[PDB]
Amino acid sequence: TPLVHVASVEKGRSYEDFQKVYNAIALKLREDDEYDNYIGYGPVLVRLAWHTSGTWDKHDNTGGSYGGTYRFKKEFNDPWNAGLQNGFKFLEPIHKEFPWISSGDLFSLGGVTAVQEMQGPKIPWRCGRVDTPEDTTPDNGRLPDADKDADYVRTFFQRLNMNDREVVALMGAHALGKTHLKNSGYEGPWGAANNVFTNEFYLNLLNEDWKLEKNDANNEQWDSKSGYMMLPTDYSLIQDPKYLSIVKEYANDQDKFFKDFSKAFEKLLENGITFPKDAPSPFIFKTLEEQGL
Ligand code: HEM
């Protein structure tokens, strides 16, 4: 059946220990600001948290964030993961300073820290992921393709136990960063800010004038005169009438999008993990700004 992965708290560690890790990540995000033409490492860390969680299969509980298996070559060389090496490199000195944190805890915490420092919603986070051996590394091909339609997106996300609202909310993370032709065969940002977490993805889908064009890798993407782009999968959220209603909702309610994204993102990062009844409550980390740091 399904594998069982029980959360086990890094020995003797508590909220204060993880806040220190959060702070080191946040401080380095501030420090290494030049990355990717001054976008900074925020977006790639969010993508790293999603990709290391998104291999999960609810049917048998393979993949998922628990095992921290991205550290192994099969997964880091996944063509779907091209570019994430930048996120992993960023995290190296963090892991060196705090060698006690598990890899899955670090990859997932990198995502939480990035969202929050980029002025996104608070994302409650739980510790206790435990490194698993190389033979537990899921095969390539569990991450989604971008050249597909709404039916594909809907079916894909059923494997991660996500419903329509959860899918649309999670996709709003595409406010962040950009596609890079050398990584994915798509080129351009989804919006203007790209290192500030807002509902701009939805506003842009609805409000820009989009043209279906071919990029330099001979792949179709939707382009706007403002210099933004949408993947076929992004654009499918306004082609499908059920997705469209939810896009409109998030475009018109920043708080609702924040609340829903926080729930879906924590869920994504926790899928596959069994938390003991007496496990600590989820942690809500203070930002550097809230700490006066
Ligand atoms: C249908 C599902 C999805 C597809 C097909 C997809 C596809 C892509 C592609 C092709 C890129 C560009 C990679 C590159 O060239 O560097 C990208 C970037 C990104 N994705 Fe997604 N994605 C999906 C869902 C998600 C989800 C659920 C999240 C998180 C909640 C996410 C977060 C990000 C972020 C933050 C970036 C920017 C990374 C950077 O700037 O380096 N994506 N995605």
Side-chain angles (χ1 to χ4, degrees), residues 2-3 5-293:
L3 295 146
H5 288 138
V6 184
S8 180
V9 177
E10 288 93 337
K11 180 173 182 55
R13 302 292 169 178
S14 66
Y15 177 79
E16 92 229 340
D17 295 280
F18 299 97
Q19 180 73 253
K20 295 180 185 176
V21 186
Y22 177 109
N23 288 175
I25 296 169
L27 283 166
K28 190 177 171 69
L29 278 173
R30 192 188 270 172
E31 174 65 19
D32 297 343
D33 65 324
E34 70 282 5
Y35 172 73
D36 203 0
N37 293 301
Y38 291 84
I39 296 176
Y41 278 96
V44 73
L45 289 177
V46 173
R47 196 188 204 222
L48 181 56
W50 138 240
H51 275 213
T52 54
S53 303
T55 58
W56 185 60
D57 190 334
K58 69 179 175 177
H59 304 282
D60 59 11
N61 193 27
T62 53
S65 67
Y66 183 86
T69 52
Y70 176 90
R71 69 194 197 277
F72 297 116
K73 71 181 196 292
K74 179 170 75 186
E75 189 169 346
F76 73 62
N77 291 323
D78 183 352
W80 278 263
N81 283 339
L84 291 185
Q85 301 95 327
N86 295 310
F88 186 87
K89 178 61 212 71
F90 177 96
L91 289 174
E92 286 187 328
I94 313 298
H95 215 167
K96 186 156 85 156
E97 181 170 0
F98 307 94
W100 49 264
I101 194 166
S102 65
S103 288
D105 279 0
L106 189 56
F107 299 153
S108 59
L109 184 55
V112 170
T113 306
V115 167
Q116 297 199 175
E117 294 295 305
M118 297 193 285
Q119 307 165 50
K122 295 298 188 88
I123 319 280
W125 177 91
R126 306 182 82 158
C127 71
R129 295 166 191 73
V130 175
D131 289 355
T132 58
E134 194 153 10
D135 65 12
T136 64
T137 307
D139 284 350
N140 302 349
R142 288 164 175 240
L143 298 158
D145 294 343
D147 65 337
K148 301 294 191 287
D149 67 10
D151 297 331
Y152 170 87
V153 171
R154 184 167 285 118
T155 293
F156 176 84
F157 272 102
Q158 287 169 174
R159 205 198 70 221
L160 294 174
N161 189 34
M162 295 300 173
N163 70 13
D164 283 4
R165 172 163 300 260
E166 288 169 324
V167 168
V168 180
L170 283 170
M171 212 81 72
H174 280 174
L176 303 170
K178 69 189 287 293
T179 65
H180 307 86
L181 202 77
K182 287 188 172 148
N183 290 342
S184 64
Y186 298 91
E187 177 66 39
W190 292 269
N194 65 331
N195 61 13
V196 179
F197 193 98
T198 71
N199 70 160
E200 195 200 343
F201 176 74
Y202 310 102
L203 270 88
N204 288 354
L205 271 166
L206 295 175
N207 299 160
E208 300 288 314
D209 285 336
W210 302 99
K211 289 184 58 87
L212 183 57
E213 303 184 320
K214 273 192 159 169
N215 63 35
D216 284 352
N218 200 38
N219 298 318
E220 285 193 316
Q221 56 176 248
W222 295 85
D223 294 330
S224 81
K225 281 358 236 89
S226 307
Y228 314 146
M229 64 82 77
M230 294 282 157
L231 304 167
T233 49
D234 295 317
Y235 198 83
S236 88
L237 303 183
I238 64 172
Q239 297 180 303
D240 179 276
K242 298 185 199 84
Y243 288 155
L244 184 55
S245 297
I246 303 154
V247 171
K248 285 181 183 173
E249 185 180 345
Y250 293 147
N252 288 282
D253 194 333
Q254 292 182 106
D255 187 61
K256 184 66 180 176
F257 163 56
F258 269 35
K259 288 189 181 162
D260 281 0
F261 179 92
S262 175
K263 296 177 178 150
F265 198 59
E266 183 184 3
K267 182 178 168 175
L268 174 78
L269 273 42
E270 289 170 7
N271 272 340
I273 306 170
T274 302
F275 296 93
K277 206 275 193 293
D278 65 333
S281 291
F283 299 137
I284 306 172
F285 302 113
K286 293 299 199 176
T287 62
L288 292 182
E289 180 172 58
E290 284 170 330
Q291 298 166 266
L293 262 25

